[PDB]
């Protein structure tokens, strides 16, 4: 019962049985059935009923072991479990002696089993092996039920987590049918999945640097998928999307990972109205798809504290950033914008409310600060859009038709943090401040080639999974989060 000594004992076990000719790691075991299939077929039987003349070969890992004439194990696989009832009478003795063969089995051992299904004495569904073979041996003591969490090796060694905690398994299953539902959701609308370079010549933001040796160029990992997708829009693909890894060099956080999965799509002849309805539809239908209801409960502060219900029933509240800033601070900010006096105006708003006064105090920064202290968590109760950002804050999104100095842009916040960001792209090459005379330039040139009016959108899939799987950290919804050794 000292895990190092246990490890040593089991290693020695392995070799002295290899010495007897028995191989503890056999090459192949033909599998007739899987534990869930097993359950589904045989779940309805009488209590104490055996069916002894259909012989099955089933496999799994032994997660519970209990002990002359009988042995009970708990065999698990595919996140589900059946009991293993070994009877002396049914055992095929010529394969090996009963005692010796079933004494070799320890918890965590992966075994093949030849036997017949039936339910137990009072009829818990079980398989009765005529013989039990060791497919792979576990050399370590598996941590017990609550042995992990806090742990945090759980991120380092994930397999242990997936074995012991069901919640993580369930979490990841959920993650991939979130992505599944997203991909299908898009595909059904005629969207087109593509792959875009992860190493680009030009990369404004905080990148990684990598180097190709023989091409002898230093390249940067992508901060987003946007530009080449828009170039694809220019190319005749008018509905296009990509689900892929994106990279940023900034610091790690609860909600931040250097490596995060994003879904960015571009949609021709659509503006942020169709994008908003797209968001409402997607999130509503997704939440209903998972939970059979639009209402979910999410624990923001710990598990130990009162959750908050989040209602994904559409439509979601839309808040003009500037307007409600102007209403709450009760000053008329602008007329637009960065503009000297208004700067000063904004700055004083920042000081009296004892907010950060971020430096350098340019206008965009001040607007971001103001907008987030005031607006960003205004509504927790459900996802809400922050709309019509100033176009000093958004030198991509096209100018708002009616409201000048603003953009057509929407940013969807769930539970105080950013999830979705979508805007109508600016297709006028003369109105893009970014294109300079003497890559990104390929996008500007493609822009000279007449990109149609198009709305774009991008997603937080890691964070979305966080909220839908009810987790407070991004590392819980990621299989192997990046960590320092």
Ligand X SMILES: C[C@H]1CCC[C@H](C[C@H]2Cc3cc(O)cc(O)c3C(=O)O2)O1
Stretch that binds ligand X, among 318-326, 368-376, 440-448, 460-468 (CB under 6 A): 460-468
450 binds, among its own copies, ligand X, none (CB under 5 to 8 A by kind): its own copies
Tokens read off for 174: 């959920």
Please say which residue, 135 or 246, places its beta carbon nearer to ligand X: 246
Tokens read off for 95: 């394969």
Q: Which of these, 112, 101, 105, lies nearest to 73 by C-alpha position?
A: 105
Residues 231-260 contacting ligand X, CB under 6 A: 248, 250, 256-257, 260
Q: Residue 308 CB, nearest distance to ligand X (Å)?
A: 20
β pairing state of 209-212 and 295-298: unpaired
d(CA 269, CA 184): 21
Q: Residue 434 CB, nearest distance to ligand X (Å)?
A: 18
197 binds, among ligand X, its own copies, none (CB under 5 to 8 A by kind): its own copies
d(CA 14, CA 182): 47
463 binds, among ligand X, its own copies, none (CB under 5 to 8 A by kind): ligand X
Please say which residue, 11 or 47, places its beta carbon nearer to its own copies: 11
Q: Residue 394 CB, nearest distance to ligand X (Å)?
A: 13
d(CA 438, CA 403): 33
d(CA 228, CA 102): 60
Q: Residue 484 CB, nearest distance to its own copies (Å)?
A: 5
Please say which residue, 161 or 411, places its beta carbon nearer to its own copies: 161
Residues 70, 153, 173, 205: which binds ligand X (CB under 6 A)? 205
The yes or no reply on residue 131 touching ligand X (CB under 6 A) is no
Tokens read off for 280: 């409402």
b/e code 406-444 from CB counts within 10 Å (16+ = b): bbbbbbbbbbeeebbbbbbbbbeeeebeeeeeeeeeebb
Where does residue 192 rank: exposed (0-12), middle (13-18), buried (19+ CB within 10 A)? middle
Residues 458, 468, 477, 478: which binds ligand X (CB under 6 A)? 458
Report the sign of the C-alpha dihedral through residues 222, 224, 230, 233, in that order: positive
The yes or no reply on residue 418 touching ligand X (CB under 6 A) is yes
Q: Residue 228 CB, nearest distance to ligand X (Å)?
A: 15
Q: Which of these, 164, 193, 175, lies nearest to 64 by C-alpha position?
A: 164
290 binds, among its own copies, ligand X, none (CB under 5 to 8 A by kind): none
418 binds, among its own copies, ligand X, none (CB under 5 to 8 A by kind): ligand X
88 binds, among ligand X, its own copies, none (CB under 5 to 8 A by kind): none
Please say which residue, 72 or 172, places its beta carbon nearer to its own copies: 172
Residues 117, 118, 455, 460: which binds ligand X (CB under 6 A)? 460
The yes or no reply on residue 463 touching ligand X (CB under 6 A) is yes
d(CA 285, CA 468): 13
d(CA 420, CA 385): 9
DSSP letter string, 41-90:
HHSS--TT-B--SS-EEEEEEEEEEE---EEEEEEEETTEEEEEEEETTT
Please say which residue, 137 or 375, places its beta carbon nearer to ligand X: 375
The yes or no reply on residue 326 touching ligand X (CB under 6 A) is no
Residues 6+ away with beta carbon under 8 Å from 28 = none
The site for ligand X (CB under 6 A) is made up of 205, 248, 250, 256-257, 260, 262, 418-421, 458, 460, 462-463, 474
């Amino acid at each position: 019962v000292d895990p190092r000594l246990y490890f040593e004992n089991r290693s020695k076990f392995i070799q002295d049985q290899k010495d007897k000719g028995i191989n503890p790691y056999p090459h192949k075991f033909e599998r007739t059935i899987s534990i869930p299939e097993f359950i589904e077929k045989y779940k309805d039987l009488g209590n104490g009923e055996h069916l002894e003349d259909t012989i099955l070969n089933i496999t799994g890992r032994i997660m519970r072991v209990s002990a002359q004439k009988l042995r009970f194990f708990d065999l698990v696989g595919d996140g589900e479990k059946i009991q293993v009832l070994a009877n002396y009478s049914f055992h095929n003795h010529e394969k090996g002696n009963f005692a010796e063969c079933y004494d070799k089995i320890r918890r965590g051992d992966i075994v093949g089993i030849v036997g017949f299904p039936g339910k137990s004495k009072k009829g818990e569904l079980s398989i009765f092996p005529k013989e039990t073979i060791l497919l792979s041996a576990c050399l370590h003591m598996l941590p017990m039920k609550y042995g992990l969490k806090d742990t945090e090796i759980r991120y380092r060694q994930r397999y242990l987590d997936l074995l012991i905690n069901e919640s993580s398994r369930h979490t990841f299953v959920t993650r991939t049918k979130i992505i599944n539902f997203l991909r299908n959701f898009l595909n059904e609308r005629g969207f087109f999945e593509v792959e875009t370079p992860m190493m680009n010549l030009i990369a404004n933001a905080r990148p990684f640097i990598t180097h190709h040796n023989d091409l002898d160029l230093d390249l940067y990992l992508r901060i987003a998928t946007e530009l080449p997708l828009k170039m694809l829009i220019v190319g005749g693909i008018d509905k296009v999307y990509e689900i892929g890894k994106v990279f940023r060099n900034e610091g790690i956080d609860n909600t931040h990972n250097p490596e995060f999965t994003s879904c960015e799509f571009y949609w021709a002849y659509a503006d942020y109205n169709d994008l908003i309805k797209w968001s409402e539809d997607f999130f509503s239908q997704l939440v209903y798809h998972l939970f059979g209801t639009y209402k979910i409960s999410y624990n923001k502060d710990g598990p130990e504290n009162q959750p908050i219900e989040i209602d994904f029933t559409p439509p979601y509240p839309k808040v003009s950033i500037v307007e409600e800033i102007e209403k709450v601070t009760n000053t008329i900010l602008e007329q637009p914008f960065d503009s000297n006096e208004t700067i000063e105006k904004m700055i004083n708003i920042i000081k009296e409310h004892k907010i950060e006064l971020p430096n350098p105090p340019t206008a965009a920064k001040l607007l971001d600060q103001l907008a987030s202290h005031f607006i960003e968590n205004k509504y927790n109760d459900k996802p809400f859009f922050i709309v019509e950002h100033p176009q000093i804050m958004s030198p991509l999104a096209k100018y708002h038709r009616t409201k000048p100095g603003l953009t057509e842009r929407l940013e969807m916040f769930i539970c105080g943090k950013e999830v979705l960001n979508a805007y109508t792209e600016l297709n006028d090459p003369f109105k893009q401040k970014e294109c300079f005379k003497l890559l990104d330039s390929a996008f500007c040139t493609s822009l000279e080639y007449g990109l149609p009016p198009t709305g774009g959108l991008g997603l937080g899939i890691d964070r979305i999974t966080m909220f839908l799987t009810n987790k407070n950290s991004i590392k819980d919804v990621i299989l192997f989060p990046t960590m320092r050794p």
